[PDB]
Structure formats: structure tokens, C-alpha cells
Amino acid sequence: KALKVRTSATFRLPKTLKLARAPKYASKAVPHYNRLDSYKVIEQPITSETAMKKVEDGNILVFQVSMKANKYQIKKAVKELYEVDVLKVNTLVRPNGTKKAYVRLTADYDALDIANRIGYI
Amino acid sequence: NPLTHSTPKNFGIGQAVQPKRNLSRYVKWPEYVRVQRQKKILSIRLKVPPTIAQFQYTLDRNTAAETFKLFNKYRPETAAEKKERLTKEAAAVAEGKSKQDASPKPYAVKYGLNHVVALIENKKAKLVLIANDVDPIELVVFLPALCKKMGVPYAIVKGKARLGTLVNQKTSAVAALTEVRAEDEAALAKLVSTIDANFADKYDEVKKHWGGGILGNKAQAKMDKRAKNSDSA
Amino acid sequence: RPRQYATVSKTHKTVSRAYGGSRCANCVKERIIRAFLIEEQKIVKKVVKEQTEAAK
Amino acid sequence: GRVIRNQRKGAGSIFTSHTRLRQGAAKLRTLDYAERHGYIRGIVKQIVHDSGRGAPLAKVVFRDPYKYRLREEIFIANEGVHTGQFIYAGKKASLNVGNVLPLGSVPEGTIVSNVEEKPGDRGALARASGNYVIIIGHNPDENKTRVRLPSGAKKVISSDARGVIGVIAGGGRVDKPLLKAGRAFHKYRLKRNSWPKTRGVAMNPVDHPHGGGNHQHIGKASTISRGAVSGQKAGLIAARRTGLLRGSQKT
Amino acid sequence: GAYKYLEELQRKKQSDVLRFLQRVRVWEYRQKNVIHRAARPTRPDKARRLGYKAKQGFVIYRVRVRRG
RNA sequence: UAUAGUUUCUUUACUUAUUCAAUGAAGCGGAGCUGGAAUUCAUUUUCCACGUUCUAGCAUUCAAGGUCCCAUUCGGGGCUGA
RNA sequence: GUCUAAUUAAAACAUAGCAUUGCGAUGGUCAGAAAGUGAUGUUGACGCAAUGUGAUUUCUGCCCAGUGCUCUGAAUGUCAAA
Ligand SMILES: [Zn+2]
């Protein structure tokens, strides 16, 4: 039995086989329901006269929103609920601690129309 | 052919770059490897006392081979054939009321250190095999003198792995024979003649002789340099 | 600035010469001359060495 | 009493040397194969002021013979080196300036600098401005070289111990005055927080072993035993004589 | 058995054999980590004397501590 | 001053213990070619080298070559080159 | 130039310059409970450390008995533990 050649003065850890798991029991026993869905990301609209002006003029909608959301989820959620292509979405956190989403739609839609469709103005 | 050309490069000191020569001697090994090697080194470098290194006198592989052949003949039974023997004898003592004697007597080998040592203390043993390669040497260093005192032959064989494989284990470090059939008892007799000639006839002088103390290549070379240049006439 | 270098195309970044946008052209000249000259010198040194030590 | 200045300089919070404007250590290349079997060429590419030092440094470039790269080194410049210069370093090299011949190879009467103390410390002796080491003699059998150090000290060190040929640069520096606490300020603020020095005899006795008294006077003699302790070793320590010396170093 | 022989030989602490082995093993342990897993004990006699029955769930750890 | 034992100061030797330092742990040691000297007093007795110095260039792809195989084909592999 | 913030801004401190002392890295000074620990130090006597005096000019006298620091060991002094 002879030796082996070596070109480097280094020894490094061999690249053994990195196994993957074979669990004998699933961890938590339930696939947790979707923590975040449309009905959770959108709490309600917003009522103030400023919002009324924005919906009247800019073809914009103003929703109160979960602080765990983002614009991707909001766009998807509004598409789901109200069937309204939203163009852009802008957000802030109101100092009473809650997310506020302005939502600019597209000219195929009228925010006032869908607002009275919802029921509120 | 006419396009190809012999370039050859100058791999001298400052001329060019060096190639991937082999450097296994210059490797940074891990520490278990270093510990292995340096431990063996220190063991030979220190003036070993004599009971150690009347170890280090393993058998010639030929005699070893014949001993292993014999012991393979006298091997024990594996658990499967043991269980089927047991089914046989269970039916036999259930039908004929045999006293566990319908099953014959065994003639086989006796692994186990406590066992073997009691066998020597009672002098039941005809032969013992002792592995050189045991980690706590304290388990075995006394056995030569013990076998010499009870007057039975011992063989410092090579490979506790080999004995474990002999008796269906990983390692055993030791084995022994106490009851042999006449089919190869004379083979055993000339064998143990060789064994006592190699071990129990030289026990005294190897017990006198301190071993080890062997140096490295480099140190040996400088020592003999000193030797030649000193005794040069 | 460097990210703007990454915007622009090659024409704005280097020159059509060997060592376009790394070294001065006069330095290119100088080092080319150096190479040619000293490799010729190496050659004549090699052959005079070979022949004198062949005599010796 | 109270802890005192040196006794805080050991801990070294504000007394650590300043490092922002240094090019790293200046060191001799490793004694690997070539410098102990032959030599190697390097190119002095540039010369640069190192801050806090008084000498300049030489950014030199060699080529790793084992790998396709250019390994850079920082040396100390001796007087006579320059840019774009070929510095040959090793055992089979030539006895000119910049080269790194071993002390075993050089002859007596020779000048060297950046000399090693044991082969593979890479620059210990005579690294400051204008300081040189002189060779004295060899004992090649049991290879040793006698060398005279700028303190006048005749040391004996090995022969494979490298050392750069030449005199360290930036000489004459302390021939000039400073004239200005500001000049000294700038000096010591790039070196380390070591200035101004204030007098213990002007301190209070809590703050020093001289401080106090209605008159600024030491009181107890300033020549201190070497076997004193940390807190007492203010003054002249392990001293053999004091006062003005008139005559010779006598060595 | 063996263990009686082992224990007596361990009492003979200053013989050439035991002090040689002492030397070897102390070098080993010193060049090893300060607390390291031993899979089999150095002194099986004493371990069996104290409670180490050789089976799955008994562990040896060798450790060094500074003297004085 | 001369003794058989008994103690103690000194000198140096061995590396492995201990300690120091480097290093990506690269060229350690020995022997050997190939040359120079050696006087070989018989054959080498030993010693030196055992690829680089006018020049701010460049040096990388298991090295090209040579060589033996393979399945020739697109190419693949080993020895030397070292 | 700096200080006693909230009673003292000065002749005090500092300062440049003068002088002395220790140290060649197995080291000097200092630190740390220790430690495979650390600051000077990415340093090397034109340097690091510790002192005194206080620009320049001129000049630095006598005393080593005392106290300290230090160099001897050639010694029937004293002389612990083991
Ligand atoms: Zn240029």
C-alpha cells in the first residue's frame, strides 16, 4: 500500500455527504392557515373629507391597513377583493400607529364608483 | 511537428515559476495525525524497559498463517447456527428428554481475558495468543511471565483485529486453546515447539534487554558523520 | 465615477491600442523597447556563454 | 498614595502608538528557499515617508516563485537606493547597496542595517535613521559573527542572519533643533501620547515620589535600585554613576 | 481474572514500566485538548471498581487542571 | 603523598520532555549524477559548484517537447522533462 | 501656550534647548486574578523608558565621610529551609 501525491501544503476538511432530514414526526402537526390574507391586510377604508377629495379627484382609494403588510400584498389584495387594477400604491404609518395606504387606480376604473359599490362614501 | 517546438522552461531559483511538485512531507496535518506519529516516535525514542519490546517480536507471517488456519478450524459458532442448534436440541430434549447432551460437546476457541487468565491459573491451557497492538499495554504485559510461571506456551501474535475477526468480534486482543482434537494435535505440538523456541527459551535475555532508543534519520546521519570524521585515521 | 464607467460603452473607457486605458502610450513604447532589447541581449549572452564554456 | 504615570502607561489606553498613517511593518522577506540557496531580484517601485518613523521606506516588489503573483514588501531605505532599482537579495547575491547578503558571507569592515538577531525575525537591529552596524569578524566553524552596534556593543549573532547593506537613511535629523513646542507636539502626536512631560517634584506627593514640600526639592536620593518595584521606579534606575561625565565611554 | 493483576501493578507506581507509560501518556494528554472524550478508559479496573460497566451510556472524559 | 568505599564543584555531549520564533507548514537531511580542484599512489583520497545581475518589460492554464500506451475522433492517459 | 469650572491666571505648569540614567529583544519600563495574556511595539540606541533643569550668551567650583545607587569577591564574619 503506497502513499498519495499532494500538491498543497494544506489539509482541508473532506467534502463528506451532507445528509438531509428524515423526520419521524412532523413538527407542529398543522399547516398554519394563511396569517395574512386580503381580509386581514385591509381593515377598512378611511372616511375623512381629505380622503373624500382624493377619491373624487385623483381616482385614489385610502385604506387603513395592517402594519405587517406591504405594497405587494396590498395590490394583490385589492385585486382579489374589489377587482380593481391599482396603478401605484403609497403607504405611511400614522402616529396613532397604523398603516395608511393611498392607492392610485387606472383610468378603466373610478374610485368613487367602486366606493359606493362597497357602500361607503 | 514543424509547428511544435521544444520550449523547455528554466525552473531555477529566480528564473521562472515552480510547478506542482509533491509536498506530502511538508504538510500541515491535523493534530490527531500528529499525535499518532509523534507518540509512536517518542515510544521508540525512549529507552523502553524489557517487558515492552519483548513485545515487538511478533511472529513470522508463515507460522502466523498456520496458527490462524488451525484456529479457523477450531472457530466457534455464529449466532444463527447457534439458534438452529438450539431449535434442534429443544425438540430433541422435548421428545426424548435428553439432558442437553444430545447436542455434542464443543471443541473450539476461548476468547476472553478474564476467562483465559483463569485458564492459565488452573493450567487448563495448551496455547495462548496475545495481540501486540493493545492500547493499554497493562492488560497484557504480565501475561508472558504468568504463562512462563504456569508453564504454557504463548505467542505474541500481530493483530487484535485479526483475533476479533477470528472469533466474530471487532477486536479481542487475546485468544487461547485448551482442548484440541487429535486431527491436528501433532501440528499443534510442533507449532508450540516453534513457539516456545521463539518466546519461552529467550524470555530471560529479552527480559534483560532494554529496547527502543532508536533515533531519527537526520540524527542518525549526523551521529555517523561524527563517527566517521572522528575515527578517520 | 465608477458606476458611470459601468454605464458607458467601451469607446469611452479605453483606447484601441495594447494597454489602452491602463498605461501611458509613451510608457508602452518604453517597455516594448525594453523587452525587445534585453531579450536580444539575453540571446547573445547565452550564445557567448555557451561557446566560451564549450571551448573550456 | 496614588497610581503614577508609567504605572498607567503599562495598561495603555491613551498611550498606544498611533497607526492610521503607517504602511504596516517594515520587514525582511522570509528566509524560504532562495535567500538560503541563491538570490532573488526585486524592483524598488517607490519610496515613501512613513508617519511616526523618521526614516523613509521602500515599497519593493518581488515575485512569489511558487505562484503567479507579485508579492510586495516594505523595506527601510538606505542612502543610495532609488526608484526603479534592482535589489538582489539572498546568499549568492552581490555586495552593493540594498542587497541582503548574509553576515556569514560579508567580510569584515562591512556596513549593514536592518540586521536580524536570529534568522527569521526579519529586521531588528539598526532600523532607525542613520544607524549602521559594523562587522568585526567571524567564527565560521560554529558560524558566528561579531558585530558592533551603535551603542558600541559587541554582540555575537548567527551567520545566516540576514541584514541589508548600507547606512539607514534620514540621517542628521536630530542635528537640527525644533525650537517649538508645536514641532514637538506634532512629532509626538503622530508617534504616541508621550508629551508634555511634567515634573514629579512639581506634583504632589500623592502623585509622585518627589512631589510636595514648601520647596521644590526631591528630598530622597533619585538613584533607584534595580530591585525596586512598580511605583518606586521614578528617577535614575540601576545607575552606576551620575553627574556630568568628562572623558570617554571607555569601551 | 486480570483486574487483580492490573490493580496491583497500578499500585507499583514507580517501576520503570509504569513511569515510562506515565511519561508517554502525559505527553499525549498535554498535546491534546484540555477536556476530551475518551471512548475507553485508561484504567478499566478502577472504572469497573467505581461503576463503569461497559455498555451504551457510559462515557469517559479526560481532563487536566492546573496544580498548586 | 598512596589507598577501598562515601559525598560535592566543574566541562561538554543526545533528542523527545519543556521552552522560543517563523510558515499559506515548500525544497530538510542523506546519498547521487554533471563538471572544477584535489594527489589521485590506485580508484578517487576529499573539497567547491551542482540553470538567474548593464536596463523600472514579460513570465500563470496538471508545461511545451520527447517518450509508452489507449481505441484515434473530437482525442484520453502514464514516464521523463524536474 | 496651559491650569485651580463656582473667591487665586501668577513669578506657578509646560516649552524648546542642556544634562543624566536603564535597555541589544532570552531585554528595559509598565500592566494583568491568571492565561497559548498584554502596552511601548506596524518599534530597535539619531530608538523606547525614567529623571532633573528650563530660551540664547557666559559659567558650572571643592566634598564620596553620611544616606542612597553601584562593582568586587580573593574571604575561618553572619548564614534559612531542604
Ligand atoms: Zn505613463
- Biggest sheet layout of chain D: 5 strands, antiparallel
Strand percent estimate of chain C: under 5%
| Main interface: chain pair and counts | B-E, 24 and 21 residues
Q: Could you estimate the helical fraction of the residues of chain C in percent? A: 55-70%
Number of extended strands of chain C: 0
State the end-to-end distance of chain D. Answer: 42 Å
User: What's the number of helices of chain C?
Assistant: 2
Beta-strand residue percentage of chain D: 15-25%
Q: Could you give the order of the helices and strands of chain D?
A: HEEEEEEEEEHEE
Give the SSE order of chain C as H and E letters.
HH
- Terminal Cα span of chain C: 64 Å
Note the overall shape of chain C: rod-shaped
What can be said about the biggest beta sheet of chain C?
none
The total strand number of chain D stands at: 11
Structural class computed from helices and strand pairing of chain C: mainly alpha
What are the distinct ligands in this entry?
Answer: zinc ion
Shape by Cα distribution of chain D: globular
- Which strand order spans the largest sheet of chain D, edge to edge or round the barrel? 8-7-6-5-9
Overview of this protein structure:
It is classed as translation. The structure is cut from a larger assembly and holds chains A (121 residues), B (233 residues), C (56 residues), D (251 residues) and E (68 residues). Chain A is an alpha+beta fold and 121 residues long. Chain A is built from 4 helices and 4 strands. By secondary structure, chain B is mainly alpha-helical. Helix content of chain B is 44%, strand content 6%. Chain B has a 3-stranded mixed beta sheet, sandwiched between helices. The relative contact order of chain B is 0.15. The chains are: A alpha+beta (121), B mainly alpha (233), C mainly alpha (56), D mainly beta (251), E alpha+beta (68). Chains in contact: A-B, B-D, B-E. The interface between B and E is medium-sized, with 24 and 21 residues. Zinc ion binds at residues 23-24, 27 of chain C. Residues 23-24, 27 of chain C line the site of zinc ion (ZN). Chain D binds 2 RNA strands through helix 1, strand 1, strand 4, helix 2 and strand 10.
